[PDB]
Design a protein around this ligand. Structure first.
Ligand SMILES: COc1ccc(C2=NNC(=O)C2(C)C)cc1OC1CCCC1
Ligand SMILES: [Mg+2]
Ligand SMILES: [Zn+2]
Length: 330
């Protein structure tokens, strides 16, 4: 008939949480038959009316989403389609923050969400440094500079050239040039080597923050608009510790699996084992507390100031999760 399977019904009930921090993204991956990026991107595009606004044929959208999801590696524990789906949905919730209501154009919203979806595509489950130290083809292609992030962009864009995959076929050249620049600026900013400069600029922006009447953020130049979108997708990328603990612990298991596999590949080859990649010499709990204290909490504390007090529950969850990991240090 033209009615859904019962599995498709349970999935649609889970997707009702799509506007909430703490979406059961792992369950959505189970119910979608490992299609969390495709169903969550589709739901978000419908909810934000992006198909109508950008004249995206729904068949082209689904073909591109499935092609893009297929170029995430199912055998990589963290940097997979589920992480991509998570960052997309998290970016979606951050865009909906009251303090940013009516700030960003449809093109900017599209850029942030599209960027989120492609931001780790074809990730091999090892670091830029590993790819450089092994003389990998990727490191050679990109002159050791933001190797993975250049690759994710190039793959994300290249997949638009596959059969019925050009979701931007109806955008004008002007819209396409603008969207392209914003997507490149956002994904290059996911390289952790850029974290300190991004955070410095976000702090500068909190100190010189102007609001409109009704208390929404004023951003009147490209440089300020893009820096907020960059920090937003960066916050989405580093949002695992800010999620309900049952989600956070699953992300911790997965990043540690990926890191230990890198360490095993380094030990095998007699390379120096990278920080927190040695399964024989690792404090999972102390590593998470260090991650929160030095990287995640400073970023989210500065985000929370920018959009005060929209992010208070997210920051409270981060601080609760931090105390939980601290209390399990043996
Ligand atoms: C859920 O714990 C994490 C989640 C993500 C990340 C990262 N995101 N990508 C990146 O480039 C890094 C900074 C490695 C790092 C996480 O824990 C760190 C602390 C224990 C291992 C790494
Ligand atoms: Mg990345
Ligand atoms: Zn990522």
């Amino acid at each position: 008939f033209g009615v859904k399977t019962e599995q498709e019904d349970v999935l649609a009930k889970e997707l009702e949480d799509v506007n909430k921090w703490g979406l059961h993204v792992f369950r959505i991956a189970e119910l979608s038959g490992n299609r969390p990026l495709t169903v969550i991107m589709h739901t978000i595009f419908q909810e934000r009316d992006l198909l109508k606004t950008f004249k995206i044929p729904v068949d082209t959208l689904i073909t591109y989403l499935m092609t893009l999801e297929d170029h995430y590696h199912a055998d990589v524990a963290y940097h997979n389609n589920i992480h991509a789906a998570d960052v997309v949905q998290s970016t979606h919730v951050l865009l909906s923050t009251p303090a940013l209501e009516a700030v960003f154009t449809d093109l900017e919203i599209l850029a942030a969400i599209f960027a989120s979806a492609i931001h780790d595509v074809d990730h091999p489950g090892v670091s830029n440094q590993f790819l450089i130290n092994t003389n990998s083809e990727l490191a050679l292609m990109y002159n050791d500079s933001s190797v993975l992030e250049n690759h994710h962009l190039a793959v994300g864009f290249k997949l638009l050239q596959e059969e019925n995959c050009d979701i931007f076929q109806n955008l004008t050249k002007k819209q396409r040039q603008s969207l392209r620049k914003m997507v490149i600026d956002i994904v290059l900013a996911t390289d952790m080597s850029k974290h300190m400069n991004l955070l410095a600029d976000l702090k500068t922006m909190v100190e010189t923050k102007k609001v409109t009447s009704s208390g929404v953020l004023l951003l009147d130049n490209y440089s300020d608009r893009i820096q907020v979108l960059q920090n937003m997708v960066h916050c989405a990328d580093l949002s695992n510790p800010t999620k309900p603990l049952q989600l956070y612990r699953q992300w911790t298991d997965r990043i540690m699996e990926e890191f230990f596999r890198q360490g095993d590949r380094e030990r095998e080859r007699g390379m120096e084992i990278s920080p927190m990649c040695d399964k024989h010499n690792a404090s999972v709990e102390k590593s998470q507390v260090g991650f929160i204290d030095y990287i995640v909490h400073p970023l989210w504390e500065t985000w929370a100031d920018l959009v005060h007090p929209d992010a208070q529950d997210i920051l409270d969850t981060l601080e609760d999760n931090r105390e939980w990991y601290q209390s399990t240090i043996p």
